[PDB]
Amino acid sequence: VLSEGEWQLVLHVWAKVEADVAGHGQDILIRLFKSHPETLEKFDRFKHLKTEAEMKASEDLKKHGVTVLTALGAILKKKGHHEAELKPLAQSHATKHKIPIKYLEFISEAIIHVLHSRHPGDFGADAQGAMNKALELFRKDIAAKYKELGYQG
Ligand code: HEM
Incomplete structure (x- = not known):
């Protein structure tokens, strides 16, 4: 679980x-890409x-980037x-788009890198750690849904 302090760091940068x-x-x-x-x-x-x-x-x-974020x-x-x-x-990404969980790890790394590039003052190590934990939570919960449907691998 993320603590309230950790969520505040995540949402302040968001x-x-x-x-x-x-x-x-x-x-x-x-x-x-x-x-x-x-x-x-x-x-x-x-x-x-x-x-x-x-x-x-x-x-x-550019339009699809807005949809994703x-x-x-x-x-x-x-x-x-x-x-x-x-x-x-989870349902669309597993069964329609056929995206493996590993690609969700890759986009998580891309997000962290771009946030560091654009917001260095508000994206110190403590905020990077919190964001990593939030994205790990996201991935863990998607992976459970994938497993139910027969797609975790
Ligand atoms: C932070 C992670 C992600 C978010 C929040 C996200 C979100 C979305 C949303 C909201 C849509 C449109 C509705 C839907 O089809 O479910 C979509 C479409 C799609 N996503 Fe993702 N996505 C993520 C990661 C990925 C990754 C890593 C891939 C591929 C490597 C991917 C591939 C696709 C594809 C192929 C479509 C359909 C695009 C089209 O033809 O219009 N998504 N995604």
Whole structure:
């Protein structure tokens, strides 16, 4: 469990992400795709993109980054009481999009890196530790749903 102090660190940095949801979202997806090119192949929508400049120029990619971060923010603001928000996401990602849990680890690393880049004053080691713990909780709960449905591996 995260303590209340740990959740406060998470949500204090998240409030700053919300000042520029589209810019953060774009940066996170591009870092994922560049660091782990296998992930791009899961997106029929985006797999025509071949350079960082092309990724940065895509309005549709920017729009999807907003969708991703909006959903993640709604989960974080539940402070662990996220069953209703998380279940539908797990179901779509396991059974429709066919995303392995390992790729959820990769996007978690991309989020942490981008937050460090953009918010160094509010994203010290104590806040990095708290954010890691929040994203671990997210992954643990998705993995349980995957296991029920026959997708943990
Ligand atoms: C923080 C983690 C993630 C969040 C919050 C998230 C959220 C979402 C949301 C809200 C949607 C649209 C509704 C839906 O289809 O369920 C979506 C679509 C999708 N997600 Fe994710 N996602 C995450 C990670 C991933 C990862 C790591 C991958 C692939 C490597 C992925 C692949 C997809 C695909 C392929 C779609 C459909 C896109 C389209 O064709 O419009 N997601 N995701």
